Amino acid sequence: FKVHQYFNVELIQPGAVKVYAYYNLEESCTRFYHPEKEDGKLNKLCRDELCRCAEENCFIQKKVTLEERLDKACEPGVDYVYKTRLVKVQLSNDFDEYIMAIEQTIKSGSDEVQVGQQRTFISPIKCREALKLEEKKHYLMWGLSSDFWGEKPNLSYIIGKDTWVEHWPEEDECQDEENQKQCQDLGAFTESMVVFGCPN
Amino acid sequence: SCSLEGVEIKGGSFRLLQEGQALEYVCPSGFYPYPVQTRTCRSTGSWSTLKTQDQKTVRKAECRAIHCPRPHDFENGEYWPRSPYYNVSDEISFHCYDGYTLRGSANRTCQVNGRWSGQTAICDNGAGYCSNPGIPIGTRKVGSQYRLEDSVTYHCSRGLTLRGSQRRTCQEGGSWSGTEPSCQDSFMYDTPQEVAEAFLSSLTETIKRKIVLDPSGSMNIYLVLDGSDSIGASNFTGAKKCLVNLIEKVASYGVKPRYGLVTYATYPKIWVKVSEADSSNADWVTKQLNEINYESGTNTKKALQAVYSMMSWPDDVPPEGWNRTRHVIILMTDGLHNMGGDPITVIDEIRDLLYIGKDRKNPREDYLDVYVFGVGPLVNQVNINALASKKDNEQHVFKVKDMENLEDVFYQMIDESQSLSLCGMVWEHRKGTDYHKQPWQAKISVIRPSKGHESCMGAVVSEYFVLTAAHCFTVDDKEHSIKVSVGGEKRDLEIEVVLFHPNYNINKKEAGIPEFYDYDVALIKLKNKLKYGQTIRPICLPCTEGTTRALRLPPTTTCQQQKEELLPAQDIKALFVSEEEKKLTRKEVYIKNGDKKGSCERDAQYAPGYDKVKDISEVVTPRFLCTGGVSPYADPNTCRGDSGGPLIVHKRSRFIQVGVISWGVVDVCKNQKRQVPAHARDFHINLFQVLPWLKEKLQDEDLGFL
Amino acid sequence: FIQTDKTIYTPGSTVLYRIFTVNHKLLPVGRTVMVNIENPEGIPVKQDSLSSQNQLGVLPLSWDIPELVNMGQWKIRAYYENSPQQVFSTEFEVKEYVLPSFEVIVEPTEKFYYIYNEKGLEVTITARFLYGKKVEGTAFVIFGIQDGEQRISLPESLKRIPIEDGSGEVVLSRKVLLDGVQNPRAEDLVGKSLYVSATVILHSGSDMVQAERSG
Amino acid sequence: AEENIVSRSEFPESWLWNVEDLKEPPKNGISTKLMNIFLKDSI
Amino acid sequence: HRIHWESASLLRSEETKENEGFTVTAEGKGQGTLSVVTMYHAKAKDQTCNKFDLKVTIKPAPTMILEICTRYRGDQDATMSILDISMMT
Numbered sequence A: 001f002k003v004h005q006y007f008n009v010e011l012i013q014p015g016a017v018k019v020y021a022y023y024n025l026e027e028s029c030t031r032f033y034h035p036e037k038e039d040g041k042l043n044k045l046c047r048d049e050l051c052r053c054a055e056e057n058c059f060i061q062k063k064v065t066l067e068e069r070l071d072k073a074c075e076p077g078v079d080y081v082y083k084t085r086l087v088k089v090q091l092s093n094d095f096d097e098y099i100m101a102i103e104q105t106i107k108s109g110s111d112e113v114q115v116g117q118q119r120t121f122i123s124p125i126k127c128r129e130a131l132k133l134e135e136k137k138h139y140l141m142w143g144l145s146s147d148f149w150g151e152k153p154n155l156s157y158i159i160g161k162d163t164w165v166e167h168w169p170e171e172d173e174c175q176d177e178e179n180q181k182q183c184q185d186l187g188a189f190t191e192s193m194v195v196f197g198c199p200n
Numbered sequence B: 001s002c003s004l005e006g007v008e009i010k011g012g013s014f015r016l017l018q019e020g021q022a023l024e025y026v027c028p029s030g031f032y033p034y035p036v037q038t039r040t041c042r043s044t045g046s047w048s049t050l051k052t053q054d055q056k057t058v059r060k061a062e063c064r065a066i067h068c069p070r071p072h073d074f075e076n077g078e079y080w081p082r083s084p085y086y087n088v089s090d091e092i093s094f095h096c097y098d099g100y101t102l103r104g105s106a107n108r109t110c111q112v113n114g115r116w117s118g119q120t121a122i123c124d125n126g127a128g129y130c131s132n133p134g135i136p137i138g139t140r141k142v143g144s145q146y147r148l149e150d151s152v153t154y155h156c157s158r159g160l161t162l163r164g165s166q167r168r169t170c171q172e173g174g175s176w177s178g179t180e181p182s183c184q185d186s187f188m189y190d191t192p193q194e195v196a197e198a199f200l201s202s203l204t205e206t207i208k209r210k211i212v213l214d215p216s217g218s219m220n221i222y223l224v225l226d227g228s229d230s231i232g233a234s235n236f237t238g239a240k241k242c243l244v245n246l247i248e249k250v251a252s253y254g255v256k257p258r259y260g261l262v263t264y265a266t267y268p269k270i271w272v273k274v275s276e277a278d279s280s281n282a283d284w285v286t287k288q289l290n291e292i293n294y295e296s297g298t299n300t301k302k303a304l305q306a307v308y309s310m311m312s313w314p315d316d317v318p319p320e321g322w323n324r325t326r327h328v329i330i331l332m333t334d335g336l337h338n339m340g341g342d343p344i345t346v347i348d349e350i351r352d353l354l355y356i357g358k359d360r361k362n363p364r365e366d367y368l369d370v371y372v373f374g375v376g377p378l379v380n381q382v383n384i385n386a387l388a389s390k391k392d393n394e395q396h397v398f399k400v401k402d403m404e405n406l407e408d409v410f411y412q413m414i415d416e417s418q419s420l421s422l423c424g425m426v427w428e429h430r431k432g433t434d435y436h437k438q439p440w441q442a443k444i445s446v447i448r449p450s451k452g453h454e455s456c457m458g459a460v461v462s463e464y465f466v467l468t469a470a471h472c473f474t475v476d477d478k479e480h481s482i483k484v485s486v487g488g489e490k491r492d493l494e495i496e497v498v499l500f501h502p503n504y505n506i507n508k509k510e511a512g513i514p515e516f517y518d519y520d521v522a523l524i525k526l527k528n529k530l531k532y533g534q535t536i537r538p539i540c541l542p543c544t545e546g547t548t549r550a551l552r553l554p555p556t557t558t559c560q561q562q563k564e565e566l567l568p569a570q571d572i573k574a575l576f577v578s579e580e581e582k583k584l585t586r587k588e589v590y591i592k593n594g595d596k597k598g599s600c601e602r603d604a605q606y607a608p609g610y611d612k613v614k615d616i617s618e619v620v621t622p623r624f625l626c627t628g629g630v631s632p633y634a635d636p637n638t639c640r641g642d643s644g645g646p647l648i649v650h651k652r653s654r655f656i657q658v659g660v661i662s663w664g665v666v667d668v669c670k671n672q673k674r675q676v677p678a679h680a681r682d683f684h685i686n687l688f689q690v691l692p693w694l695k696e697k698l699q700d701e702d703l704g705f706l
Numbered sequence C: 001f002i003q004t005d006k007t008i009y010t011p012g013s014t015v016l017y018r019i020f021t022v023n024h025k026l027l028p029v030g031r032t033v034m035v036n037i038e039n040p041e042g043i044p045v046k047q048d049s050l051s052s053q054n055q056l057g058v059l060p061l062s063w064d065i066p067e068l069v070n071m072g073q074w075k076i077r078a079y080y081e082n083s084p085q086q087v088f089s090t091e092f093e094v095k096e097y098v099l100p101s102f103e104v105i106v107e108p109t110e111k112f113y114y115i116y117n118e119k120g121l122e123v124t125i126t127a128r129f130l131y132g133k134k135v136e137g138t139a140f141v142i143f144g145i146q147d148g149e150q151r152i153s154l155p156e157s158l159k160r161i162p163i164e165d166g167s168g169e170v171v172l173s174r175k176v177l178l179d180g181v182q183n184p185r186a187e188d189l190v191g192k193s194l195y196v197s198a199t200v201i202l203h204s205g206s207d208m209v210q211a212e213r214s215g
Numbered sequence D: 001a002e003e004n005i006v007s008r009s010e011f012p013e014s015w016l017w018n019v020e021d022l023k024e025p026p027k028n029g030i031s032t033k034l035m036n037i038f039l040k041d042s043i
Numbered sequence E: 001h002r003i004h005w006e007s008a009s010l011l012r013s014e015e016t017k018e019n020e021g022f023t024v025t026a027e028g029k030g031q032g033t034l035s036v037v038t039m040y041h042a043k044a045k046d047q048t049c050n051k052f053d054l055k056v057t058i059k060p061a062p063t064m065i066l067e068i069c070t071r072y073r074g075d076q077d078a079t080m081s082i083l084d085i086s087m088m089t
């Protein structure tokens, strides 16, 4: 049958259909539906036992300047400041895993970190276009302390709502006039937190 | 600094502290700032955003009335009455169902501190391995199984933070592993008295008290400080005194401990190690304690890793005394915003080195104790609680309003072992009575023929003299017509003499003024000596050696300096004791000794017999003190039966009386529970204007007069 | 007289009960009582012994239901200490349930049934909320026969009706009842009773109230 | 909106499990007892 | 624990959280019974939608339309079935 609409609503929720015999209700079959979802199933990322759904925004906004980085990087909830380079991506249906190599860490986290060990990161499929990630390029990011996910030492940093990831141009791109200011601000901010760091 | 516009508080006052780096909100009793207390002037030119629990937008900053946490649940019973919110001094009766026995306080009223008076009320049936841990107010319990190895979960409602154990597991001894949880707020602070009581109870064993150890064994203390960018002024002003007093006090229990000193701003620094030969001597450790200087951030993980290195040994086989030594870590962090990880893992390492978190047959949980003291309003209670230790019936996590309470705690701990001779000593007993909080108060009853009995009160200042008002008595009264009661005792004490000021006269009759209160003071000399008791205990007097040592100053300090310190040319905090339904309480009152004095003295025109006085200054002598009213803060008035009480200014956990209540503007006190004029003020008689008379009459009491 | 606060319980709650010890004058007396809590299998999981001295006949006891427990008819058996054969019983459910939002009653216009009715059997539906209001929804009605230790259902008499403002009107025809069984004679139904099983679903499809007027 | 407004939480299936004593002097064998109880949040 | 004839036939339950070997000592005179049972969850998760085969589809058409295809899993047809459909916002 035809289902009409009357008002445009942002971030609709999926509906469900439940079929059951008139005498027993516990032997029912509930199936969801949604125009842009698989079986009306909210996007959650799992490792066979533990989940935290990511029906949120990949990022906030991208504009951002040196003062913006200063105010949004000295937050009480930030834990690590890491620069990485994209090496391998494992595209799939449920999620995608990004494996990086660490050059050097601006800020230390509660997990054992050193130059050389591999790190994995997970994001929902909705970030496949917003962040336009590309391989063989450097990046710098900081995020919420609730990123830890997995078992030691193969933990992962989930790119959730509070996770902030920004493009770190290499030497070749830092020579471009468009990104010269961004590269200089990134270097100054890096040395700032290396020497002095956030107050308190 | 940042812009000062649009940062004030409605219904309160704002001031610039740390040279404009911060601003603090304050209102008197019954009001606390909402939703925050302080804002930080960042480098963007604007202060820190108004952050709520859900991080919402705030239209304006106001200081909201003090309410009291609602019971999130009370299983197996009822509470009476039930309200969406509970006011100050509201009372609940906790009633159990049938077959459930109550444990705790049934009649519970919650004071201005924000917690209900007494122990948490529990109804238990007693049919398990361990008992009901209780359901504290605002915290709700998950798990009705009280067998062994069963654990229960506690958590708070909206706006409340949990301090205690997130999950308690029943132990094989029959107890629960962890401290009793509670729901806390940002405005709530622990008073220094109960902090000292809990610190003594956890550290010592009651008999007096003692710090026992394993035979042929010693203990180690790790005093750790924070060099955060919050106060860090003048080489830890007060903190050094706190640590010196603690070191002196612990050595007075007959045991010689060992010490270690850690301070960190950006990297940890080692001052004393447990391996030093002279680490068991108080003199040298105090001397090095006085040699601490600044050279930012808060890197607690690295500092406690340094402490870990101190604890650890370099030998292959474990050294001697590895399982016969007790470790105490004391941390005075004002910040603890993590930078470099969390310090939980290093605590796990520390307890794994000592074989604590590996077996349950020999837990050995009592060989490591971590105490963390919270300073300032920028504290994160959950992080402190997760960093400190937790053992049942003991409190390892504290919190104070200001740095002053930090040394108030330790001065009280020093004074605890002192002889009962000195004045100002009041111990906050766990199961105290009414007079356990105000023991100096004494009540005087006057019986007159065919006339109503007159009830007044005064302060016991020695073993033979009681200071009171003089208008409560007349020269017509005989010796047999005065009765004195102390500490709620039926037995009376015979009187010997009452002394009045030579210039005092209760009869300006021709000047049109009906009543005058010049030098309205009375000194009652007792027939016998007073035996010091739990609720009978003297009070100090201004400009005395006892007052000099009370304010923690050298004996060379002058009386004028004491007057300036206790009574500056600004607003002065104090409180007066009131009686309501055979019970005693404290009402906070403020003294106006600056610009507000001249206006306040005018309010006496509202008093009876003062409307026709031509010279308003004549009736108000400089020896009077004008308090109360709504300016600059709302102050309750003294009641008709409350007149003549002692006005006392509290300082360093010491009670010093600064005057005697004389009269008031209007008698509208009974409206407090039921509408008070803004001109209602209370006038009291100062004690600094009768110093020669006090010295003359009280020269045989050995009070160290200056 | 063992009286519990409820009739049905959940795993993870508390059974509260009062034993009223009276004598043969129905008057309070002081004795000693032995109490047993038996599982649905028939073996006690807890036993206790209390005294009623200066208690005025009220013995309040309690029991905690484990979260990992067997469902069914749990029993409390209390008897006087002097009389082990004086067992008094109280059976209560343990089930995984949730509160219904309304009571449905199925009532016949004629409270009996007659073999030679030329019209049929009329039963009406009163589905009212537990606070005494009226509903709007639909209901399913089926019938059956209460034979010896069995239940025979008639899928032909499986009717659906709109509950019009807390009211219903269901008519069971004689032909359907006759075709339900394979007996040439209707008089053989004398000595057996029918049962009506109704189940009312709200227009929101929220609650699930299955009510039976057996007998 | 939904911040300064409380909700209903206490939904027990059996409460008022209490005891009471009739001690008022009799009036033709009937004693009056006026007691305050608070009905549960359940509707 | 102590077992007496008068107080026998009582369920003495000892609860344990950790999987470890146990050692019992049965002394005195008489007999007894002992049972050790571990109640837990197993990863034998099969399909539950056993008795139905509900399938749904949304298809825009030239105000999108919804289609529901159902089937009863058994050797006989089903009686009056109830189909609850919840619309979106």
Ligand SMILES: *[C@@H]1O[C@H](CO)[C@@H](O[C@@H]2O[C@H](CO)[C@@H](O[C@@H]3O[C@H](CO)[C@@H](O)[C@H](O)[C@@H]3O)[C@H](O)[C@H]2NC(C)=O)[C@H](O)[C@H]1NC(C)=O
Binding pocket: B065, B083, B085, B087
């Ligand atoms: C507990 O304390 C509250 C607040 O102190 C009492 O509320 C009383 O009535 C209103 C309702 O909040 C309070 O607010 C003020 O009332 C004035 C009217 O005089 C009105 O213009 C505003 O709504 C204003 O906010 C009022 O302060 C308070 N009454 C008094 C005398 O302070 C409440 O009655 C107390 N008791 C209980 C059981 O809640």
Ligand SMILES: *[C@@H]1O[C@H](CO)[C@@H](O)[C@H](O)[C@H]1NC(C)=O
Binding pocket: B093, B106, B107
């Ligand atoms: C609790 O207080 C009420 C009145 O405030 C009193 O009637 C009752 O006896 C008190 N309960 C005690 C003291 O146990």
Ligand SMILES: *[C@@H]1O[C@H](CO)[C@@H](O)[C@H](O)[C@H]1NC(C)=O
Binding pocket: B234, B235, B291, B292, B293, B294
């Ligand atoms: C703090 O101590 C340092 C060295 O210990 C000293 O130079 C400085 O003057 C002190 N600050 C004072 C006395 O205010």
Ligand SMILES: *[C@@H]1O[C@H](CO)[C@@H](O)[C@H](O)[C@H]1NC(C)=O
Binding pocket: B323, B324
């Ligand atoms: C400490 O450990 C040693 C290691 O063998 C042991 O001999 C000694 O008894 C222990 N001390 C105790 C248990 O008090």
